[PDB]
A paper describes a structure:
To further analyze the structure, the enzyme was crystallized and the phase problem of LbXyn43B was solved by molecular replacement with a resolution of 1.9 Å. Clear electron density was observed from Pro6 to Asp540. LbXyn43B crystallized in a tetrameric form, in accordance with the size estimated by SEC and OMNISEC on the native enzyme (above) and with the oligomeric state reported for most xylosidases from GH43, subfamily 11. The tetrameric structure is formed by a dimer of dimers, as is observed in other β‐xylosidases in GH43 (Brüx et al., 2006). Each dimer is stabilized in an antiparallel way where one dimer's catalytic domains interact with the other's β‐sandwich domains. Two loops from the catalytic domain, Lys92‐Asp100 (LbXyn43B numbering, between β‐strands 6 and 7, blade II) and Thr144‐Gly156 (between β‐strands 10 and 11, blade III), interact with the β‐sandwich domain of the other subunit. The sequence of these loops is conserved between the enzymes in the different strains of L. brevis. Both dimers stabilize the tetramer through loops in the catalytic domain, creating a large cavity between the dimers exposed to the solvent. The most extended loop that connects β‐strands 16 and 17 in blade V (Ser269‐Arg290 in LbXyn43B) contains Thr274, which is non‐conserved in enzymes from the different strains of L. brevis. The active site of LbXyn43B is in the center of the catalytic domain, is solvent accessible to allow substrate access, and is orientated towards the central cavity of the tetrameric oligomer. The catalytic amino acids are very well conserved, allowing unambiguous identification of Glu187 as the proton donor, Asp14 as the catalytic nucleophile/base, and Asp127 as the auxiliary residue.
Numbering used by the authors:
A (entry chain D), B (entry chain A), C (entry chain C): 1 to 540
Write the structure that this text describes.
Amino acid sequence: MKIQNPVLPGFNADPSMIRVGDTYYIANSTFEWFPGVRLHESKDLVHWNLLPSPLSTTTLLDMKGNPASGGIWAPDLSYADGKFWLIYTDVKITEGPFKDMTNYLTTATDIRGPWTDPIAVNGVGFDASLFHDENGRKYLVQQTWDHREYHHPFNGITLTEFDTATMQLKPETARNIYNGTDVKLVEGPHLYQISGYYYLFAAEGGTVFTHQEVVARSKTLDELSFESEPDGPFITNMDTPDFYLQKQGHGALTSTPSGEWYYASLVSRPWNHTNESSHDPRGWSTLGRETSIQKVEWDDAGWPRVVGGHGGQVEVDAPKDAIETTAPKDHSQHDDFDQPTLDLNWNTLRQPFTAQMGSVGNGELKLIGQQTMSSNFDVSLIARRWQAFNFDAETKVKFDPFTYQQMAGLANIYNDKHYSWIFITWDEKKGHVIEVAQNDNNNYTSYLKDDAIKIPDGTNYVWFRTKVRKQSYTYEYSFDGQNWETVPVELDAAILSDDYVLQNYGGFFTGAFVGLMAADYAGYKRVATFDYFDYQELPD
Amino acid sequence: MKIQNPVLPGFNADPSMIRVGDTYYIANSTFEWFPGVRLHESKDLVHWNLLPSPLSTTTLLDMKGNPASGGIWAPDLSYADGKFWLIYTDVKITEGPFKDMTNYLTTATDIRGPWTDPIAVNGVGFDASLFHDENGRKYLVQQTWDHREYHHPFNGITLTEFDTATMQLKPETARNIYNGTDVKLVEGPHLYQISGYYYLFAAEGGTVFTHQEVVARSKTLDELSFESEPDGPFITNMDTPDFYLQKQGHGALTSTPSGEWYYASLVSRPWNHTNESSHDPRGWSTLGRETSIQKVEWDDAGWPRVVGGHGGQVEVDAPKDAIETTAPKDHSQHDDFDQPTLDLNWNTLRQPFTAQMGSVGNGELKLIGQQTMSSNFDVSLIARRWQAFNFDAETKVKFDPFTYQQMAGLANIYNDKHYSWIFITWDEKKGHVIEVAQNDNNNYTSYLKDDAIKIPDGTNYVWFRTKVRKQSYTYEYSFDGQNWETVPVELDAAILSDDYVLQNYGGFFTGAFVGLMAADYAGYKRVATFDYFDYQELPD
Amino acid sequence: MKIQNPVLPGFNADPSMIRVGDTYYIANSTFEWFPGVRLHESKDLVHWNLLPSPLSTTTLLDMKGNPASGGIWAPDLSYADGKFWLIYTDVKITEGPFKDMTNYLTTATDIRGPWTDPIAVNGVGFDASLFHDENGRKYLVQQTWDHREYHHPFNGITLTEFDTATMQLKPETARNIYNGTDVKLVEGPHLYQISGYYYLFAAEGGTVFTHQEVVARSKTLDELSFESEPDGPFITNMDTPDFYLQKQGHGALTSTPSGEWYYASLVSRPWNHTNESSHDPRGWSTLGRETSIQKVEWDDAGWPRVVGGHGGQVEVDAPKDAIETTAPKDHSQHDDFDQPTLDLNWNTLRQPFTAQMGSVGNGELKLIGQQTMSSNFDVSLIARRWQAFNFDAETKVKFDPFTYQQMAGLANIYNDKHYSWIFITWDEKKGHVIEVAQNDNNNYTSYLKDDAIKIPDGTNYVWFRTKVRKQSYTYEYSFDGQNWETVPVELDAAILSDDYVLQNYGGFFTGAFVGLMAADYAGYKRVATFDYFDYQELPD
């Protein structure tokens, strides 16, 4: 009976939410993480189950070499004409005057797939959304990039009509339907036909603490015909600096079977170090942009308003007609690698898990060492989101390196310039050793150096653990699985947060992950064998 | 009779030079420019002709998404066992603690191809070189990357033996043969068997003004057996700060049929702005790393020495047995696009010229607008090196944009963050206009803005010209090909120089190019038609 | 018999060297260190004694608030008309388009003083030098600052004539006598009348590794009449990157009684960390700019040349008529504070040692805690130069702090943003403790924090020691003077080097010092008592 926000914890950004009959679906952005577009299902809005990602082949999504926080930006899921339509955007540039992107369309009769070979739709801007008019016409509504430095870069909301026989746009039909408000950065447009009006929802202010969603309406789809909601915005936490939820905005409106109204929003829970002002910095989002759900009611003038005020609520009444959905009690994961395919919570960087990266099955994960976590190409790594502030993760691994260019173990990663791990490697004095390293915006630290821990001569497998405790984390190791030693360094979790990455890079749209990887930049394909992976969430 | 250095002007870096009978060949690094590996041929060392590049397919070279100054680093061309062997390196990371690279091998019975499908050899380090021992054994000798921040990053010269039946390395044979001198950054290793000794040539000091080449020798290929040449180095311009040639070092030794000896080196001719100290900065290399050739003699103790002293000479005596080679008088280019394939002097960024980029033939180049010059993906651009300090380039282009996201014209480019051009685009008030823009490390300037030049309603084609004058350059346009207007903006050529890019980016290994491109980041594939391209070199 | 360079080790920059009869004098720049202008005397050029500094009162020198590496730049000492003339410069701005300076004149009949109340001469530029023409006319010759960013900042060598009755300049006589060479940054001018010519010595290239001295001559003092020495420069180590001496240039020529010729130059001995290329960075000068002396001979065309070539020599033949001079064997210092005035080797920051800073005598130094080493105002600190690569320094101090804002101990300091120390302070949990801190360009580290060492309840005095070992240094403490504990942190000496400070600040002209200080930024004037100071130089 009670939605507890965030409902989708950890990296679950840019929710597109729809209802088909009694079933709700949310699609989230995935950026450089493969497979592309995360899908979840529910019948109550409270409990959610992970579905297979649509963009699961290189025919659907080719992101080798993509910059971090390029790839899949906000997706748009829709249902019309007896099928699912997915608009998705592959962004190739994350900084500077340009943001070159391609918007694609795929479809499916079943939410689990298979998905049709993608059609390229256009560029123009990101946050592309398929509007299905009740009269059978279809349109793309999107953000509009402007590279001209003497203008504002978000040049209104473009609406362009499809030829529905080919699903190619007719570019001559393009127009700006809405310029937004003085907060600018107008994006994330969605159109809805409600009570004889077209309602436009749009995100503004950028996806940090000044984020908001605004609402406009028009009787038509004419150029600059949309009028802004009075007493706006619809949702923001800009002016609620102490609230548990922050950065709400970009999202999607859905009805229930009974005619209630809900809004899924991206959201963050940024925390502070003990010595910081709570209001500067407002905090660090290690769990990145998650998804919340807010209830909506309509005021007497026909404008939608968030229940509990424009900041939303932590706890929200579930739909009256909610059908109870069974879901795991938390996001803990206990993987024996018993199955021939990866658990759905695992993701790879940019590319599918192929035989080149390794194999899973019969109780073992094998990763073939290729490029380091610093590469945008051919990284043999699997990882899953941080979905709690406190957790323990553990593995048991065997690796036989003969050079220092071979490394394998347990990692925490944000991107190619923000990661850490504890790993087995080789050194000239001791042979097989354990080291811990952190890459902090290419300031790279090896903690143990010459004092790397010697792996005793009888030792086959090494056990590794990371203990994440909100603001900080540690690595531990064991030669028997029972007696553990802590490596005496406390790592700052803020290094793996959106708010930290934003300081020196314009792509900061994911969240921290934990996982397993092997590297061999000697190019000799050294194999690491992992017997299990455990991720155990702890109370907050 | 007289070699005039640089013999290969403009971007012609990292020369690997061999002799087969009476013919000399030089292979140069190409980085992100496609096709990969530049080849030149001569029988006199004075005059050189361009041959087809070996790495001309995505089976041989796949660099989509590569960072600028990644891709093809120093290549190694060798002839043994009646065929050509090419070792080449695709570098995927240009900054930070790692430099993930793969070394590949292809072979050919004819220097013009075809080349065999590549074998992956290893990583370990760049500057990989195939040593063919007279006894039939074969080895890879290379630089050795060390990511450990508490060590020096260039960890000696690794030698590893091949299994010659499969041409796969036997990693257990790896050893460090040479640690270099205190100047460090030891790389560019080549081994030669001469007069009963193995001679090792290696580059040191990095490829900027502290570059040098050193020589070592051993009776064996044993671990750390190589002894440094006394009274070194072999070549450097570090300590000749006023000399016309700079940055000499990384290169290759060849004999002539009569037993003379020559050394090809990379080289630069960096210039100064008027107000700068000649010694700080030492200058700006718009023509990048070019190739020089120096004569070598052997001293009484059996050590090789450059004729004219360790700084080399501008003019060098050609081989006594030189066979005259005819070559074009300069590198001017007059292209009517009359042929169905591109002139060899044209390159693309990262990827082959496919139908997706456009077409050439019957007097026209068609470029299909795709991503901007800011992208590492799908850029419809062809360009050729700056090969003189002073030149005029000109084209005639037709383009019908309906949005400001469509741009086409005449460009000067170093990389995705360092380029300029004059182009046709569209604006809201005037329609078809001419603009000039410069991207200076993502500081992007539109020069004309609202004062972009209106293209008159009669106008089919627009003519564009760039005049490069060493330190600075301008753009001009014409609506009839006879009456020209100069855009009143003088651009700094130093923005397209290795030495400028080095200030904020660790990949700075190419050189300035001039060419033609079309962009359509609206994604509507707008086509630009170019009737010709002219590149006219002028005296220094 | 043998000058061993550097003859004046540690910070002894910008030597002005003259001879009066059989006695040589060198004056050196002192920047923010008080008293101003360092003076040394010798009769052999091999052994040197420190004399009292001229600028010993606030009437002569007022530097409170001066930026680090402002204050006293290159001085000029001359002897004519039976007295010493000192031109000195107080620089108030060290970065940006301006470098506002005032040049002053003081005189003395005795080198040890007293010195006359200073006359303000002009601004115009630094490196002002008094030229006494044989014909009785007198001139100021100087560098010429140009703030205009579209010009080169060093606008030739200005010569302006004095009215010798008032020793005020006649501005109308100003002209540029010499523009220098393409190396630019022309400064440090000195004029000499020799063999019917005016010879001009000038420094160029800036005071780092591209430093050089050039020589020009003219029959007149006419505008742009000076012609450059062929086959220059006169002195440089730019092109001797492995030589023990570096950065030679700015200096002064003197004759001996017998007609021999010597040149005193500033010089450095920059060292490398073990992992660095010897040529980039060329190294770290913890001992700053020291003084060397080179021998000069005249070629057949009447041009001066350094004996041993333009790089100079480490060891140089002393004058034939040299009179062996008694001097301390090294710069060790054993100070019991038995005297009522400070040993001459001690300096203060910016201001005289007044009763406000404390007192000395009867076996004790008392420092009254005022502002921290981070301040340009009222710092109770005395310090002496690092003058060897390896040394031990030690003190015994009593201090009774009641707040953490009170700190006193043994410091190593370069400037307000580059220092370290071990000190007594107070903390909330333990009371009197020992801490170590480093300020590294305002990245401030407290090493022990909560684990600061508790000072036992009976302890009156604490003993402190620093052991400097070229590239690195440590701190030790003792509660009895016999049993020592090392604080387990190795500090990088490069943080207190010119070459490090230059990376982020345009004033980098001094050198590392070691000394004693007390701070009380609670403003309660807490007094630290030091019983002795020992500085013991060790072999290289």
